Swiss-Prot record:
Localization annotation: Secreted
Organ and tissue specificity: Produced by the crural gland and detected in venom from the spur located on each male hind leg. Is also widely expressed in both male and female tissues, including intestine, kidney, spleen and testis.
Residue pairs linked by disulfide bridges in the UniProt entry: 9-39, 16-32, 24-40
Annotated keywords: Disulfide bond, Secreted, Signal, Toxin
Protein name, per record: Defensin-like peptide 1
GO cellular component, one term: extracellular region
Task performed by this protein: Does not show antimicrobial, myotoxic, hemolytic and cell-promoting activities.
Gene Ontology MF terms: toxin activity
Lineage: Eukaryota, Metazoa, Chordata, Craniata, Vertebrata
Main subcellular location of this protein, as a coarse class: secreted
Regions that span the bilayer: none
C-alpha cells in the first residue's frame, strides 16, 4: 500500500534539488521525497 501523498517531482519529469539551490527553478507543483528538497526544471 501507500500513503496520502499528492504529486512528487520525478512523477512529473522533474528533478529533486535543495529548496535553497539558487537558479534551479522550482516546481510549485511537483514534490520531492527527501522532505527537505524541492522540484526543479531539470
Amino acid at each position: 500500500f501507500v500513503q496520502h501523498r499528492p504529486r512528487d517531482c520525478e512523477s512529473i519529469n522533474g528533478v529533486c534539488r535543495h529548496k535553497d539551490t539558487v537558479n534551479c527553478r522550482e516546481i510549485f507543483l511537483a514534490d520531492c521525497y527527501n522532505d527537505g528538497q524541492k522540484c526543479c526544471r531539470k
